[PDB]
């Protein structure tokens, strides 16, 4: 799971994009936040798309 901190519990539907993480063992997969139970990275404001964050409203 990437981002800034997830909201995922246990019996929750998640979607996977793969792509090796270098550090971790057995884990070749990123969860794609922004779909199903993995709701978007709240407070995220820069690189949105990768994280599933809806547009924040300007002035």
């Amino acid at each position: 799971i990437p981002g800034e901190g997830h909201n995922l519990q246990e019996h929750s539907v998640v979607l996977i994009r793969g792509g090796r993480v270098k550090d971790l063992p057995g884990v070749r997969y990123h969860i794609v936040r922004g779909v199903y139970d993995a709701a978007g990275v709240k407070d995220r404001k820069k690189s949105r798309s990768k994280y599933g964050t809806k547009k924040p409203k300007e002035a």
Binding site: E4, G5, K42, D43
Partner: protein, 71 residues
């Protein structure tokens, strides 16, 4: 967000384990797998079994901690 819902609880080091990971017997219940904080590594502050150390525990999985305090 930078989340400080972190528990800063004391624990007498129980188990000498590999890679400067030490199961430490908390007074917040059992002995979780708690690993050394990087500062300690930098300063070469040695942990042996039997040290009452503050161990940083996130609610997400308390299984793993962090030896925050130098004994």
């Amino acid at each position: 967000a930078k989340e400080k819902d972190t528990i800063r609880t004391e624990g007498v080091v129980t188990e000498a384990l590999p890679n400067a990971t030490f199961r430490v017997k908390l007074d917040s219940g059992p002995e979780i797998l708690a690993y050394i904080s990087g500062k300690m590594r930098m300063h070469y502050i040695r942990i042996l079994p039997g040290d009452r150390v503050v161990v940083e525990i996130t609610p997400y999985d308390p299984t793993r901690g962090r030896i925050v305090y130098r004994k």
